Paper text:
MuPyV and JCPyV are non-enveloped, circular dsDNA viruses with capsids ~45 nm in diameter. Five copies of VP1 intertwine to form each capsomer subunit that also incorporates one copy of VP2/VP3. The β strands (BIDG and CHEF) are connected by flexible loops (BC, DE, EF, and HI) that extend outward from the surface of the capsomer and comprise the majority of the VP1 hypervariable regions. VP1 C-terminal extensions interact to link capsomers together forming the T = 7 d icosahedron.
The capsomers that occupy the 12 icosahedral fivefold vertices are referred to as pentavalent capsomers, as each of them is surrounded by five neighboring capsomers. The five VP1 molecules within a pentavalent capsomer are structurally identical, whereas the five VP1 molecules within each hexavalent capsomer are quasi-equivalent. To investigate how V296F conferred resistance to 8A7H5, we collected cryo-EM data for purified A2 capsids and A2 capsids incubated with saturating amounts of Fab. Refinement of both datasets produced maps at 3.9 Å and 4.2 Å resolution for the A2 and A2-Fab complex, respectively. After icosahedral refinement, we next proceeded with local sub-particle refinement of the constituent hexavalent and pentavalent capsomers for each dataset. This sub-particle refinement allows each capsomer additional degrees of freedom to move independently of the rigid icosahedral matrix, which compensates for imperfect icosahedral symmetry present in flexible virus capsids. Sub-particle refinement improved the resolution of the pentavalent and hexavalent capsomers for both the A2 and A2-Fab complex (2.9 and 3.2 Å, respectively). For each dataset, the constituent capsomers attained approximately equal resolution. Our implementation of sub-particle refinement allowed the rapid solution of the highest resolution cryo-EM structures of any polyomavirus map to date.
Numbering used by the authors:
A (entry chain F5), B (entry chain F1), C (entry chain F2), D (entry chain F3), E (entry chain F4): 18 to 370
Write the structure that this text describes.
């Protein structure tokens, strides 16, 4: 006799991360809304807007090379990767019949926030009438670079650079020399399979050195786009309604290793030009993530009965011995036999080219 | 024996908002056509086209900063948000079996009107042959910014700015300082979760400070796009035939809280340049909305038997006491028990990192 | 025993409009191919290519404003709307059981013709090497504006302008002052719901004043796009194979009121620059329409037994009396009762805000 | 017991056009791969690369008009249409039950070849540092124009021009004056329904005069796109995998009249600028077609028993007599009666406007 | 009683190419991840970053032509094609019932790596303020050219050039003169069906001479796009989630001839400009391929009982004799008869035009 409203998913509880401390069930869905600020040059710590003008959100400046051979980019001028790790609660286990529950990033709604800010055409930027210093304050223009990644483990990065003779500072930034303790080689200018790293720190990996690794990220979905030039107009489309599916060919999506969910981001909008000279502070805007996660039963990867193994590995000493791994390995050959075949003829035949 | 025309929806009555005073039924559909004018600088009140030339639809001018440290943007030069609230009639209630009827925005047909106006190449604008002051009057160019929102409650805004040392006037405009009574901090240049507001006024929230909040608007669908630059050609596509679906993942769409339907808009097309100097009045065009609404049975959110509660709250005094909420809350812990579990071991275990 | 060709629609007769004088049947389909020439400045009448060079297809020139306050655009420089009305034959009627047959525009294939003409880089236009007057004759560039509409009644236009102090000539052009006999107000610069008109004349409504009305055209499908700038390259895609569906949400499409089918068009490609000065004649190309129509049984809208009413209205005089309509109406209230409700309490309750 | 490979269409024979001399059957499919070279100015005949540098593939130059009134475009500077006709074999006929077999173009895979050639930045073109004549040789830029057509009969062209006072040479080129023996009128600058032609010659119809006729081509599918400007960067996308469907609304596609298949093409990429002056040779690239054809049973259009008619028409003389066709026709009225209707009232009623 | 995880494909073994030495089965799927470095000018061999600055990844420079007639492009300045061949293992054969197994490229995931590197605006490039040599180091801009191909045989190339009087070096590069031992003709500037080659070498075929052949590649899927200009901003979109289907109309995709899988690539991003002059080194980025292959049963193409034939061909001498093939062939006619037709009339009738 009464009207029936339409069925919608029932919201049990909402709030902060504390809400995740409620044991819900196997088919419960969790939506986490977070944001990442642009780690582009100036750090957030000196909150006083008088040191230089609080370039938080911008770089500190830019210094061209003094000659073809020595370049020092002055870390507070290099835009870097933003990252965060959301720590989710633990789930059920099934040690009897080896099986485990973990979080599974199902969808993401992402949005770059604050593009209207670039409609600020007053201010002390290089004017449009440079001969009379009037007109409007030139807005942000130039190269744009928008990458975001959602994963269950830190984003794998690959090292690739322009001029490999660049001398980056050796602290406060993670470069190729920091990972491979040697210098940078010419192969670092195209693709070196050894210039690999992970995005564990925030504000430390510059985006002009470290790019999302295409060969590696299998628990991570990353989306990026680049636009070059010096006066390229920025373009941003924000919307409440579009969502990205994080599922893969098998319909799984990023499983949160351990219990963490990693968000990586960089959103460079272009440059600002000052008035006395042509200093070219970068501009970056924050990114909003809304990740929709569910619970999935997976097969337990670790036979943590290997604790016994760990036992025999902590009590037994650390031996060096002679190389049995690497390139100078002294292992000649390893063969594995399982069944019984008919007697072969010449047993050593392969691809014959 | 007679031919049968095709069945179409039957139009009961059409006219103004007065038409909504007719009790129609549960499956009646209502289409409301309205428009919003650009609140870009000059207000509509001085209708005389002689004060400065009636910049209604344009800004009053633009004033660059006098130095890096003091910026005063002179409110009549800041494009702001346009908003309107259409008041719909009341619907049925079901106090016996708690249930209520409210309006539900199902679709919207929106269109920016007057793009052909920008084909006016006569007039006293900066000519294309600046050395002989001939050619054509330079048309509107520059940064474009098109946002529109349809919701059941006012659009939630988030504060984000360029230079945070800007000194906006303290009346006739709503800035971040107006909402958070303190000054603007460096965090206001990237993302401060406290610089939140709502779009209740019209012509008061500048679009260079206030952006659609991605974390908040759940009864509101907003669509925006930005294009930077100084000479970027405007691009507009108007059409009679395209319509936007306002339904969400559950197939609901914006429910009109109370009975109001909120339309928010900003459509900046670029700048005009004057002749004697390079003054850079903004340009904005009106937006036409056609919202298609139906009636939906929902579950009554308020147990307005809480009127009794309101009773005990109006008679009982207003106490201050000691803080039990906030950050200096003196509440140590709150526990909720409902059922009976087996006796746990250590009852305090969480995500272990 | 014979091979069977595939069934295709059978062409009864083809030719000119005379062909429509053949009574075909209820499920016959008619395809009409027509074209509209650009009404952009110079009229077609002085066919001699010696007056100024026969700018037919171009404007006559351009004259910037002499000051901020007086602008006279010299009608032969304003691009205007092109329109045509194709008169279709009468159809059957069903006066016994009130029902009528009318034409129904089902599809349209449209195409702007002559874009290759803009590959004419010889000629006396402003050269690309302006210091030596060599290179190529600068081709057509600038703002483009492409609108076309197919309807059963004339296209409804809405008035919107740039500077409202512009003094358009009072004959040979239809402006806002022509429709509303007063001058233009500041509201005419954003949106005035009274600056409405219809596209009945051809070459008389300038496209910088009159835009397709979004609130009105319900028997008309219009499609437009605008591109600003001063040197924006034109872009045109012509094709034999694409067709636009004119049906609406109910699957009807434009019904031809009376028996006419109205085609409206404007296709501005940009400007040409002359050599001695920077005169900026517009350029426009013709548009080809191929409209596919069928017959539809509709419900007869007019109870032309109201001829009797018309009787009593032609014999009875024209009275003025006191205002019963308008804003100064002397009608206090009108109530309509049809059935019998239970006795209400307070009968005057509405939306309570 | 053996594995079964997947079924694919069986290739009977491949080679040149000679292969088509094999009577295959009714459901055989034929794929023909051909190419068309750009007929842009310089003809292919003087193969020596010393006359001027062998501009084959480019124009010979460009000559601006000497005044507003006399323009002579010097035929070897006008890009023209490329066309070819592939002659297919004859098929079966069914004179007993009137029916005929003809070829039917079902799909096309087309591709512009040689876009990488425009990466040649060495050479004697206008440098990028014009004050020191260094940098790179400016690559091809400017207006691009890409049209291709596949049909069963020659492509129908419509005449449309810029300035109609242009004096084209009267041999080696087909202009509007060549088809209509009179001069060009102002109507030739917008749309003259009499400036019609067909694409029978190759390298003779300039693309700045002759455009694909939208009203005519019904056995031809044409696709074109134009991009204006003077420095517009070329854009080309070549791919092995995309194919265009040539079928129409009835699912037929171009039937090869007689037995020929007509390919029409023009691919202009922009200009090259020389060094001593700003001569602006055009650039064009070849186009590759891969047309997929099948056989279709159609109804025989000609009752070639009309050979008897042709008999009585070759023996009987050629009379002039008085005009019975045209505009001065002396035929007053023609009426056709077939059945018997009830006696009408006024028999002369039409569309009453 | 236990939860069931979702079924996913089971990974037998992963590692290097050695992993392919495991006989898996008929429905096993193999995913190979590889990369190709840009072969753009400077070779990889002089690894010392002191010769000129290690332009590995860039060209060595650029030298304009000294006159219209002599051009020498200095091989280390020409971007060339990158290629690789992955050698896969041998599969099963079915000599009894003629049938063979071969690898079949089913999908590809490709990505250009290192676009963020172009955000390096420090360094010794031409500054943006050229009058004060300040601002930023101009980033990579200009013509972009992105082609990639996946096939079972080497990519077939077609020769097409700009100026055919260019004198390329006769070693270290493969030009049209290298393949056709004669010089280049004017036909080489549009399309010569004899200027064909194959991509067997890497870093030897310049992309300004050799383009993917549209008539030839049937076991190869290639995708390319070109963007001209001198300051065109680069645009790159990298993503983890998109994959290209290599299957064709029959649903087969590239079959690996022999056992090799050929990857071809070129990714030019634009130029870098130096400071003292306007030298214009190219820029190229590596490409990552992830090819997904399966096994397919095909029909054995070679009747290698033709070994017997090969027998009679190695023992029998090499005769010259008189031409029986070519253009001066002395074979008059070859006829093939198989069945018995009714006696024809005139047996020599063909397409009659």
């Amino acid at each position: 006799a009464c009207p029936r409203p339409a069925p919608v998913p029932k919201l049990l509880i909402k709030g902060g991360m504390e809400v995740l401390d409620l044991v819900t069930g196997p088919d419960s869905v969790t939506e986490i809304e977070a944001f990442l600020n642009p780690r582009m040059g100036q750090p957030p710590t000196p909150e006083s807007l008088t040191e230089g003008g609080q370039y938080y959100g911008w770089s500190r400046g830019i210094n061209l090379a003094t000659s073809d051979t020595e370049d020092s980019p002055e870390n507070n001028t290099l835009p870097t990767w933003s990252m965060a790790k959301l720590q989710l609660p633990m789930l059920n286990e099934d040690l009897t019949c080896d099986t485990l529950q973990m979080w599974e990033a199902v969808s993401v709604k992402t949005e770059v926030v604050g593009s209207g800010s670039l409609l600020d055409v007053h201010g002390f930027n290089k004017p449009t009438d440079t001969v009379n210093t009037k007109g409007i304050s030139t807005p942000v223009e130039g190269s744009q670079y928008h990458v975001f990644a959602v994963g269950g483990e830190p984003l794998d990065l690959q090292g690739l650079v322009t001029d490999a003779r660049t001398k980056y500072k050796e602290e406060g930034v993670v470069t190729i020399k920091t990972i491979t303790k040697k210098d940078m080689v010419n192969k670092d200018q195209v693709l070196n399979p050894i210039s690999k790293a992970k995005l564990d720190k925030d504000g430390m990996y510059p985006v002009e050195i470290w790019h999302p690794d295409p060969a590696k990220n299998e628990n991570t979905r990353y989306f990026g786009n680049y636009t070059g030039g010096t006066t390229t107009p920025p373009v941003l489309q924000f919307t409440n309604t579009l969502t990205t599916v994080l599922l893969d060919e098998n319909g799984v999506g990023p499983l949160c290793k351990g219990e963490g969910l990693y968000l990586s981001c960089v959103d460079i909008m272009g440059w600002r030009v000052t008035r006395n000279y042509d200093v070219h502070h970068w501009r970056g805007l924050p990114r909003y993530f809304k990740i929709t996660l569910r619970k999935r039963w997976v097969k337990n990867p670790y036979p943590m009965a290997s604790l016994i193994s760990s036992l025999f590995n902590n009590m037994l000493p650390q031996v060096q011995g002679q190389p049995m791994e690497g390139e100078n390995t002294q292992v000649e050959e390893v063969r594995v036999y399982d069944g019984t075949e008919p007697v072969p003829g010449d047993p050593d035949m392969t691809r014959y080219v």
